[PDB]
A = this chain, B = another copy of it.
Amino acid sequence: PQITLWKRPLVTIKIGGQLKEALLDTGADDTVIEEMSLPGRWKPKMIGGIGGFIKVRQYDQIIIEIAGHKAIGTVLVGPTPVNIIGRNLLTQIGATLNF
């Protein structure tokens, strides 16, 4: 698809058997999802942005479906205000910025 940016670029994702709404975020290096459980091992990480840092759990090799397109990669889980699909997964679905 071609998504214009008059409004927030929200899409439906499937992660851990759950449907969620998430923001396609070119300014995010990583993918950060609100608290949920995911299977497998994880390790703690700190990520920072406007407002400062939050502690998250880093899960590797997690499959997501993003607007119908499957990807795999690292997902960070923690107290993010918004679910964010960052570049680590946007690349996998072939997303580009065009102007």
Contacts and interface: CB of A to CB of B under 8 A. Distances in A.
Interface residues of A, number: 40
Total copies of this chain within the assembly: 2
Contacts of A47: 50
A26 B29 contact: no
B84 A27 contact: yes
A5 B32 contact: no
Contact of A27 (B23, B54, B67): B23
A96 B49 contact: no
Interface stretch (A12-20, A37-45, A57-65, A85-93): A85-93
Interface of A: 1-6, 8-9, 23-29, 32, 47-54, 67, 69, 80-82, 84, 87, 90-91, 93-99
